[PDB]
Amino acid sequence: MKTPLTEAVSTADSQGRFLSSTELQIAFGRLRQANAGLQAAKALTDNAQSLVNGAAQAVYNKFPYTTQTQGNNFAADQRGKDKCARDIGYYLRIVTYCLVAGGTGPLDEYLIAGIDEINRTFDLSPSWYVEALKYIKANHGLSGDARDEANSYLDYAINALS
Amino acid sequence: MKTPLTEAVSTADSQGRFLSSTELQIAFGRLRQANAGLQAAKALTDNAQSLVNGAAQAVYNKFPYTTQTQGNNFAADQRGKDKCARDIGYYLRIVTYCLVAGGTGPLDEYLIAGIDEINRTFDLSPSWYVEALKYIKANHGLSGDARDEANSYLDYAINALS
Amino acid sequence: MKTPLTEAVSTADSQGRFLSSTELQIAFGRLRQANAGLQAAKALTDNAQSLVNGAAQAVYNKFPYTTQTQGNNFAADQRGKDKCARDIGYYLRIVTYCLVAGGTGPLDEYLIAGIDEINRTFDLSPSWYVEALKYIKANHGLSGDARDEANSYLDYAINALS
Amino acid sequence: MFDVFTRVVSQADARGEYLSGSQLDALSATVAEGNKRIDSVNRITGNASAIVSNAARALFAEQPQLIQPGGNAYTSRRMAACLRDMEIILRYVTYATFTGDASVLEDRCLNGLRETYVALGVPGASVAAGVQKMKEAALDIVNDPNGITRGDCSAIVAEIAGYFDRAAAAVA
Amino acid sequence: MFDVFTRVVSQADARGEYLSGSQLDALSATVAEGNKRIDSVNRITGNASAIVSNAARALFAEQPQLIQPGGNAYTSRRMAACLRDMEIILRYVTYATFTGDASVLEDRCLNGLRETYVALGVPGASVAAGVQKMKEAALDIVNDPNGITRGDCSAIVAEIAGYFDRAAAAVA
Amino acid sequence: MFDVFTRVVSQADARGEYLSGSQLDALSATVAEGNKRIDSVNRITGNASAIVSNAARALFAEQPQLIQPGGNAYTSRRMAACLRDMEIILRYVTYATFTGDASVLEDRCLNGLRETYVALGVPGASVAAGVQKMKEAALDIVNDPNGITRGDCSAIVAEIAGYFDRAAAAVA
Amino acid sequence: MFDVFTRVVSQADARGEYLSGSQLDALSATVAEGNKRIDSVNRITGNASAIVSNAARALFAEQPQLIQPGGNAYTSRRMAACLRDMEIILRYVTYATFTGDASVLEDRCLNGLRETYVALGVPGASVAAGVQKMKEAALDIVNDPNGITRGDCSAIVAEIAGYFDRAAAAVA
Amino acid sequence: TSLVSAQRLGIVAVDEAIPLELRSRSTEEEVDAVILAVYRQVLGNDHLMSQERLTSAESLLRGREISVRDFVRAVALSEVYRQKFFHSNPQNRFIELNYKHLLGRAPYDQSEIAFHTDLYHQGGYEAEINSYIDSVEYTENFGDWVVPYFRGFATQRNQKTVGFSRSFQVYRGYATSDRSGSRSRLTRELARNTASPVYAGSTAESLRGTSAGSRNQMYRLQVIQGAAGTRVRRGKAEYLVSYDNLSAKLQQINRQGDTVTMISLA
Amino acid sequence: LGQSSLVGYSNTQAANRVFVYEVSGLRQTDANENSAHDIRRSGSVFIKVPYARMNDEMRRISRLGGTIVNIRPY
Numbered sequence A, B, C: 001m002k003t004p005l006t007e008a009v010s011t012a013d014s015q016g017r018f019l020s021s022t023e024l025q026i027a028f029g030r031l032r033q034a035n036a037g038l039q040a041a042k043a044l045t046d047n048a049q050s051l052v053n054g055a056a057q058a059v060y061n062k063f064p065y066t067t068q069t070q071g072n073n074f075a076a077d078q079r080g081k082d083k084c085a086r087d088i089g090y091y092l093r094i095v096t097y098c099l100v101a102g103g104t105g106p107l108d109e110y111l112i113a114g115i116d117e118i119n120r121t122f123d124l125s126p127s128w129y130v131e132a133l134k135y136i137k138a139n140h141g142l143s144g145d146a147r148d149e150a151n152s153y154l155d156y157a158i159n160a161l162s
Numbered sequence D, E, F, G: 001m002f003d004v005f006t007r008v009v010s011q012a013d014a015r016g017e018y019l020s021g022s023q024l025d026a027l028s029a030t031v032a033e034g035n036k037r038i039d040s041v042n043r044i045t046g047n048a049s050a051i052v053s054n055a056a057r058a059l060f061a062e063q064p065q066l067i068q069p070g071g072n073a074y075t076s077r078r079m080a081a082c083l084r085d086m087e088i089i090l091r092y093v094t095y096a097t098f099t100g101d102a103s104v105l106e107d108r109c110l111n112g113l114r115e116t117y118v119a120l121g122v123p124g125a126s127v128a129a130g131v132q133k134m135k136e137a138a139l140d141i142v143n144d145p146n147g148i149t150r151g152d153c154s155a156i157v158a159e160i161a162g163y164f165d166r167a168a169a170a171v172a
Numbered sequence H: 001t002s003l004v005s006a007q008r009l010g011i012v013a014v015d016e017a018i019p020l021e022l023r024s025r026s027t028e029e030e031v032d033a034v035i036l037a038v039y040r041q042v043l044g045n046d047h048l049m050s051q052e053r054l055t056s057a058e059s060l061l062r063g064r065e066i067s068v069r070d071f072v073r074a075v076a077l078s079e080v081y082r083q084k085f086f087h088s089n090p091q092n093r094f095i096e097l098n099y100k101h102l103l104g105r106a107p108y109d110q111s112e113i114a115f116h117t118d119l120y121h122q123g124g125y126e127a128e129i130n131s132y133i134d135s136v137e138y139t140e141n142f143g144d145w146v147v148p149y150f151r152g153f154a155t156q157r158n159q160k161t162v163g164f165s166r167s168f169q170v171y172r173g174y175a176t177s178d179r180s181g182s183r184s185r186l187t188r189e190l191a192r193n194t195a196s197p198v199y200a201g202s203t204a205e206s207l208r209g210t211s212a213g214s215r216n217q218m219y220r221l222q223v224i225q226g227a228a229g230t231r232v233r234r235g236k237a238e239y240l241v242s243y244d245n246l247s248a249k250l251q252q253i254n255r256q257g258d259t260v261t262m263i264s265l266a
Numbered sequence I: 001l002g003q004s005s006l007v008g009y010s011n012t013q014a015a016n017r018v019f020v021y022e023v024s025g026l027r028q029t030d031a032n033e034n035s036a037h038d039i040r041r042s043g044s045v046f047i048k049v050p051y052a053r054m055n056d057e058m059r060r061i062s063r064l065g066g067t068i069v070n071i072r073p074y
């Protein structure tokens, strides 16, 4: 999992070196960020139910056929809506992990690695989840460094799906 | 040349990755550090001749035989004293580079790599330079982060010699 | 391209071996198939426009939002409808190459390798193309060996897309 | 590679000189632009896929010879290689922006790239045209005043554009 | 590499066209020749050792300077390397016959062989002569009317001769 | 490899839960200690060569069988290896201190170290004694109150002692 | 590589003839000189560090620009490399002396060395000067009459001097 | 390692091996030696039949048309390598063979297995083989001109300690080969990120005295056990039993439902 | 020569292409500080590369400070 602290050691270790000022600076950079990330995680967590519900609704509005067409990959029944809300919940939850971890590591490990195969195997449009992530970006109400770091992870996912 | 910024890009490049929040945090940690390093660089530069002259004399005091014994590797004549002051000047100047760069890179590139072969070939004792670097740690009059970063580079050089 | 004859030689060459009875049987297997493949190619070629037009309309019928939604990736304007027909024409034309060559070689080389990246980048649903390929399977009118080989290539593409 | 700080160091060591007060002050002025530099890097990165694909769509619309049968970007494999190259070049431009020095772009991306395209028959001039469209999209992204502390980024933007120009010239 | 079929495909794809009726019929004509093609590959392959060994003896008899001390085919390693090269060329000619296209022979065996022999000091002209002797024996073997369903193999024999000529022309 | 933050994250994901309020606040507390952590890492690193050579000297003085002829740290090659190992362990201890999690030390350095030393015939008990010696010196160095903003480093000191203990336990 | 013997054999084989009686006699004279050749190799080898370090010291004193900041032998890595090259050349000179043929020196040391230095910006003329100083000290060491059975070594000294001159010319 | 340990572990010959480099203007003998060394290393020391040699690739190397690294890759991609190590082996056995043959080490962690299984599933055999030879690890240890050699018995930068212990599972002695497919001895310890005791050379030996039965032989049974009788104190156990009691011990272990992981003479 | 072996087993038109890289200036850097083998030539060295490995070799050279001075089709 990529985070500033694990990347610092991995690099130092691959070089067979003690940590130096360069890695200490990496740690300071982590500290400057960490509290804002933790607050971002808390703010997203508290609002998660509303964020997840609004995102699924946003996807259904942008892609009405998903709630009208029969098929295992669509949300025309409650089964599909539950799957969809669950998936969006996964994205949001793992994004909170990235804010806690201070890096995309959690997205890389838990969500992004393999998502292309899943979306093709089960015929899920990546554009659906892009729209959900857009919604969360607009409605999470963060500001400052919390908004910037949270948006970086949301954009990282959007870019991986795009 | 190990610095936070280059190491950040080196790591991302080896992964074929755009820069992410992890690397941005590395940048902030650099920005938090840079001004103290630049101030440390200035203070050391302005006091360079004093620091170098004192460090040289400290070596002569600690190792009196280096001013009494004949031989190319010693400082019994003006030739050897000049060489010796030059060497100490190299350590101090390059240390200032490390403070400017924000990492050991300049010490690694310009001085540390191959130092053992030179000292063995020309029969120069690492202990002489350790003493010189200890003097500089004891007399540069730095405080706070300037002192912390500067001592790390001096200690880095000492450790490489030990 | 991957075809019975080139694969036979490629394998033989890697072993530094003259062609043996095993490769001759591969050639006989190709001959058994060639005429039916050439007949399938001519039949698909002659009805190319009808197949391509029909397949394109089949996609529109099954995915009506493609002709109703504004966007670079959709066929709501003449531009997209022309892109779409071109694309379906590509699938059809390259499939005829496979029948001529006697393998998936042409599909692999010209269409399939990289198709995942194209569809992701340009937000094209692979389900669209699967539907177009199914239409072609249902309307090419082949029978016997010609039908079996053609459908294997259509299914090969379908499997690649899902 | 070099960054903005080590570029100055290497020049000073070649002369055997401490950095002057003017050089330290200039690097201190570099530090003061640091946050804007990070913002520009972050903004380009968060829009990487859109920058590339939009630039690619516009390129192929301007130059339909590239995608018609027989064109250099025809077939999925070549199209994907083309998109990949656009992404690569943008990635290394962000690297140069992040380090504040062109060396990573020149040493690791543009090194032998003109020769690669000639040997392959990639039309280097069309690559340059593509890079230009990514430059124009990227700068507007960096310059967007919405949702960010307001300030003057024209210096960083100018530096970014030079990295795009250097990449464009390297192939064209 | 191309075979007879994919050679036409690649050209058609480059133009974005379906194969014409004329092209398909040409390919159908090739199919009709398939059994003769297979027999010719089998016959050359079954006699490969004799074709090489007889061709080499005949070449060293006409060109004794090759096998005198200091000659290019002198010492066991060079003689063995020379015999290997003859068998390699014959092998790739049978690949080309089998595929019905010269690309395997040209891409893998011949392209660069002239330059390689020049650097080694291998006499390219003598190699061509040996290729000629293998060609003559190989064509006689293909044409042997005994033990095979009688028919006209003139077209396949002309193609095989062309492949030998490419090989000969590529060394000298 | 885990750090203090990702260790908690990984457990949360396995449970399918967001981090609770208290878990985030515990992480806030870890952030509050970050400066002390960095200082500890910086101090051990800065004294690395002395910590190893002092601990090494003391070990061989207490256990002269190690350096006697025929001993396991006798001859230059084995002495060098032994000194290298002490530095290796110290280096991985500082890594664990820096990350706030033992994974780097356990996965990369300690796992298989016992089997390695048993296989080689390196006396693990002796290695453990050396680690204990480095432990005490490092903590004294970390705990030195001179030249540093005064505060309470008891928690960090305990954590670092823990990592040293893991290494001592591992090698026997 | 060749040695003094296999050099004659290889020429003989290309002509397909036995070594003449005078060629065998000449090799016998070479054998009669074997002990002096061994002594010279041993003497240079025994003093290799001194030969290298003294010549290097003499070179930098004669050519101060090399070691000024920005000079080619400035920085430890470059100085280290420079000292290594001196030793490599001296080592290969002794190899040639040991074998009695220059082929080892030319093939494994000097081949490509001028191009290497030109590409690196190493001053080849300064290298040649350092090789001259090594040559001078080596021949004095080889001719040192003390502690060795007395005899005339002028032939071997000339042969060695040639190898040094070969090295110096290859770079300058 | 040093004589004192290498002698016990049966790796003296590995320690004294010298990397073999193909130099400019090499002789015919030196090329021959290099070709032999590549075959020994990449094919895991099988007896190589003359019919299996890569005639053409050998010629190109000898002609300096391709580098040593190219020739290693030619052999790794050959049908000989495939038949020996791929077509009859499970994937994880195939992967550790590639690590031994091409990088001269044992796999460090389960994620290496996962990476290479994914790569094979994605790009097939050629992409899998090329990953080893094109890797940073290959280029920095052997470059283009040095034949690969076993490295697992020496401390490498950026290795895991368990690489040393695991080396003894994939390197079984000088007079051995990877010829019989089979399963990996590393599966469990990779999957669970653990290590196993090194029983190699003469380290498997244990004292007999008067307690080793009629044949004076002890067998070492390594088991994984649980409490499904007397209390179980360790989930991993070893038993030393004489030949005469070996059947009884197996039956005891079997009756308890415990798993035998390894048995060998002691 | 070399194409027969350099081009792998892909049997693709794209992969059936070899290019001769001319590289110069390969020298010691921090990138190859740990490299276990010696650099023998810093002048022009020529490297045959199949199309399928052009990305890798270009990255390897560039990561090692080498300059790609020319690339020629085989």
Ligand SMILES: *[C@@H](C)[C@H]1/C(=C/c2[nH]c(/C=C3N=C(/C=C4\NC(=O)C(CC)=C4C)C(C)=C\3CCC(=O)O)c(CCC(=O)O)c2C)NC(=O)[C@@H]1C
Pocket: A144, A145, A146, A148, A149, A152, B021, B024, B025, D032, D033, D034, D035, D036, D037, D038, D039, D040, D042, D142, D143, D144, D145, D146, D148, D149, D150, D151, D152, D153, D156
């Ligand atoms: C040109 C690039 C645009 C612009 C930039 C700009 N940014 C700031 C200030 C800040 N930007 C950041 C950035 C981040 N904070 C984070 O936590 C992260 C996520 C990892 C990022 C990328 C920060 C920390 C600051 C400083 C605090 C602040 O908000 O002021 C400025 C102000 C000047 C300064 O350099 O500090 C400017 C000008 N502004 C524009 O108008 C351009 C469109």
Ligand SMILES: *[C@@H](C)[C@H]1/C(=C/c2[nH]c(/C=C3N=C(/C=C4\NC(=O)C(CC)=C4C)C(C)=C\3CCC(=O)O)c(CCC(=O)O)c2C)NC(=O)[C@@H]1C
Pocket: C021, C024, C025, E032, E033, E034, E035, E036, E037, E038, E039, E040, E042, E142, E143, E144, E145, E146, E148, E149, E150, E151, E152, E153, E156
């Ligand atoms: C010119 C090449 C000579 C020639 C050839 C020739 N062959 C056939 C017909 C056949 N040859 C085969 C070959 C094989 N059958 C096998 O099982 C194998 C072993 C693996 C081989 C090589 C076959 C199957 C046929 C068809 C059936 C038959 O027995 O004839 C012909 C007839 C035309 C045709 O296309 O079939 C010809 C002309 N004939 C000559 O006179 C040349 C000297």
Ligand SMILES: *[C@@H](C)[C@H]1/C(=C/c2[nH]c(/C=C3N=C(/C=C4\NC(=O)C(CC)=C4C)C(C)=C\3CCC(=O)O)c(CCC(=O)O)c2C)NC(=O)[C@@H]1C
Pocket: A021, A024, A025, B144, B145, B146, B148, B149, F032, F033, F034, F035, F036, F037, F038, F039, F040, F042, F142, F143, F144, F145, F146, F148, F149, F150, F151, F152, F153, F156
């Ligand atoms: C136990 C570890 C000892 C101890 C530590 C301690 N340190 C601080 C505060 C700071 N320490 C640093 C460290 C650095 N600044 C740099 O620029 C670098 C070089 C890369 C380093 C290593 C910093 C930045 C701070 C904050 C500013 C300050 O100077 O105070 C504290 C104070 C509490 C805090 O959390 O910051 C403490 C307690 N103090 C002791 O007495 C122990 C022996």
Ligand SMILES: *[C@@H](C)[C@H]1/C(=C/c2[nH]c(/C=C3N=C(/C=C4\NC(=O)C(CC)=C4C)C(C)=C\3CCC(=O)O)c(CCC(=O)O)c2C)NC(=O)[C@@H]1C
Pocket: G032, G033, G034, G035, G036, G037, G038, G039, G040, G042, G142, G143, G144, G145, G146, G148, G149, G150, G151, G152, G153, G156
């Ligand atoms: C010019 C080179 C100087 C010189 C040389 C010289 N040496 C000998 C004779 C011998 N030298 C040796 C050498 C060795 N014996 C050993 O055991 C080893 C250690 C591995 C070495 C290097 C030997 C064996 C001999 C033969 C016995 C003897 O001592 O005579 C000679 C004498 C003639 C001869 O060719 O043997 C000479 C001339 N003599 C000088 O004056 C030069 C300074």
Ligand SMILES: *[C@H](C)[C@H]1/C(=C/c2[nH]c(/C=C3N=C(/C=C4\NC(=O)C(CC)=C4C)C(C)=C\3CCC(=O)O)c(CCC(=O)O)c2C)NC(=O)[C@@H]1C
Pocket: B059, B060, B063, B066, B067, B072, B073, B074, B075, B076, B079, B080, B081, B083, B084, B085, B087, B088, B090, B091, B110, B111, B118, B122, B124, B128, B129, B132, G057, G060, G067, G073, G074, G075, G076, G079
């Ligand atoms: C001073 C503490 C003691 C001392 C010094 C001394 N040094 C030399 C010679 C050299 N010193 C260096 C060192 C460097 N060169 C570099 O480029 C750098 C890195 C930037 C360093 C650190 C080198 C390479 C040499 C040899 C070449 C040269 O002379 O420049 C000498 C003379 C040795 C000789 O044989 O000429 C001396 C005297 N000597 C003492 O006694 C002091 C206590």
Ligand SMILES: *[C@H](C)[C@H]1/C(=C/c2[nH]c(/C=C3N=C(/C=C4\NC(=O)C(CC)=C4C)C(C)=C\3CCC(=O)O)c(CCC(=O)O)c2C)NC(=O)[C@@H]1C
Pocket: C059, C060, C063, C066, C067, C072, C073, C074, C075, C076, C079, C080, C081, C083, C084, C085, C087, C088, C090, C091, C110, C111, C118, C122, C124, C128, C129, C132, D057, D060, D067, D073, D074, D075, D076, D079
């Ligand atoms: C039709 C089923 C649906 C559809 C099609 C559509 N496609 C594009 C754009 C492209 N199509 C391709 C495909 C290929 N290019 C090739 O070379 C080959 C292999 C021979 C294939 C299969 C590509 C690469 C593109 C992008 C580049 C280009 O435009 O040429 C578009 C436009 C996308 C855009 O952003 O411009 C469209 C509309 N769209 C629908 O809605 C149909 C259901």
Ligand SMILES: *[C@H](C)[C@H]1/C(=C/c2[nH]c(/C=C3N=C(/C=C4\NC(=O)C(CC)=C4C)C(C)=C\3CCC(=O)O)c(CCC(=O)O)c2C)NC(=O)[C@@H]1C
Pocket: D066, D071, D072, D073, D078, D079, D081, D082, D083, D085, D086, D088, D108, D109, D110, D113, D116, D120, D122, D123, D126, D127, D130, I014, I051, I052, I054, I055, I056, I058, I059
């Ligand atoms: C897109 C706008 C244009 C285009 C591109 C195109 N490029 C290639 C092939 C290659 N491009 C590169 C370049 C790089 N690879 C790297 O790793 C980096 C440095 C990190 C760079 C700059 C390389 C090396 C290749 C060849 C190797 C490979 O593709 O894997 C192609 C394919 C050409 C072919 O014949 O296959 C294409 C299509 N083509 C256009 O028409 C656009 C103008």
Ligand SMILES: *[C@H](C)[C@H]1/C(=C/c2[nH]c(/C=C3N=C(/C=C4\NC(=O)C(CC)=C4C)C(C)=C\3CCC(=O)O)c(CCC(=O)O)c2C)NC(=O)[C@@H]1C
Pocket: E066, E071, E072, E073, E077, E078, E079, E081, E082, E083, E085, E086, E088, E108, E109, E113, E116, E120, E122, E123, E126, E127, E130, H055, H056, H057, H058, H059, H060, H062, H063, H064, H065, I001, I002, I004
């Ligand atoms: C025999 C009729 C003539 C002859 C041949 C000869 N060739 C060589 C050396 C080489 N031949 C090749 C050619 C190839 N190698 C391959 O793998 C392939 C397929 C891609 C071909 C076409 C090569 C590469 C070499 C050089 C490397 C090697 O020796 O194997 C020699 C040896 C020359 C020498 O050893 O110096 C010889 C003798 N020589 C004659 O005189 C005949 C006219």
Ligand SMILES: *[C@H](C)[C@H]1/C(=C/c2[nH]c(/C=C3N=C(/C=C4\NC(=O)C(CC)=C4C)C(C)=C\3CCC(=O)O)c(CCC(=O)O)c2C)NC(=O)[C@@H]1C
Pocket: F057, F060, F067, F073, F074, F075, F076, F079
């Ligand atoms: C004598 C010339 C000067 C001197 C010696 C001295 N040596 C040490 C310590 C060590 N010496 C060695 C050397 C070896 N160990 C080996 O196994 C072998 C190879 C067979 C050798 C050559 C080692 C490894 C040590 C360190 C460990 C040990 O104590 O054995 C010391 C003490 C250093 C210390 O810190 O304890 C001393 C004093 N010192 C002088 O002043 C003499 C001029």
Ligand SMILES: *[C@H](C)[C@H]1/C(=C/c2[nH]c(/C=C3N=C(/C=C4\NC(=O)C(CC)=C4C)C(C)=C\3CCC(=O)O)c(CCC(=O)O)c2C)NC(=O)[C@@H]1C
Pocket: F066, F071, F072, F073, F077, F078, F079, F081, F082, F083, F085, F086, F088, F089, F108, F109, F110, F113, F116, F120, F122, F123, F126, F127, F130, H001, H002, H003, H004, H005, H006, H153, H154, H155, H156, H159, H160, H161, H164
């Ligand atoms: C010193 C306190 C004791 C001692 C040490 C000793 N160790 C070895 C050999 C090895 N040590 C290791 C350990 C590691 N290698 C790694 O890469 C890592 C970090 C990831 C570790 C922890 C290994 C693997 C070896 C074996 C391989 C190698 O030696 O390179 C020796 C050498 C034994 C021999 O016979 O050569 C020694 C001497 N010995 C003592 O007596 C001290 C108690």
Ligand SMILES: *[C@H](C)[C@H]1/C(=C/c2[nH]c(/C=C3N=C(/C=C4\NC(=O)C(CC)=C4C)C(C)=C\3CCC(=O)O)c(CCC(=O)O)c2C)NC(=O)[C@@H]1C
Pocket: G066, G071, G072, G073, G077, G078, G079, G081, G082, G083, G085, G086, G088, G108, G109, G110, G113, G116, G120, G122, G123, G126, G127, G130, I026, I027, I028, I038, I039, I040, I041, I042
């Ligand atoms: C010293 C008298 C002069 C000098 C030397 C110098 N050389 C290099 C770098 C290299 N030298 C070589 C030469 C060889 N490598 C070999 O393996 C062999 C054959 C066995 C030879 C002859 C090479 C290949 C290099 C480059 C790679 C490497 O350094 O290992 C340098 C360093 C150049 C740089 O920029 O780092 C130097 C300084 N320089 C002087 O000024 C003296 C005149």
Ligand SMILES: *[C@H](C)[C@H]1/C(=C/c2[nH]c(/C=C3N=C(/C=C4\NC(=O)C(CC)=C4C)C(C)=C\3CCC(=O)O)c(CCC(=O)O)c2C)NC(=O)[C@@H]1C
Pocket: H045, H046, H047, H048, H174, H175, H176, H177, H179
């Ligand atoms: C002959 C008297 C008996 C016999 C032998 C036999 N051995 C093998 C296979 C191998 N033999 C070895 C042995 C060595 N390889 C080495 O490198 C060394 C020296 C360090 C030795 C001693 C090896 C490693 C193998 C396996 C590898 C390989 O076979 O290539 C076989 C072949 C078995 C098979 O084909 O499966 C045979 C037949 N067999 C008898 O019946 C005789 C009693």
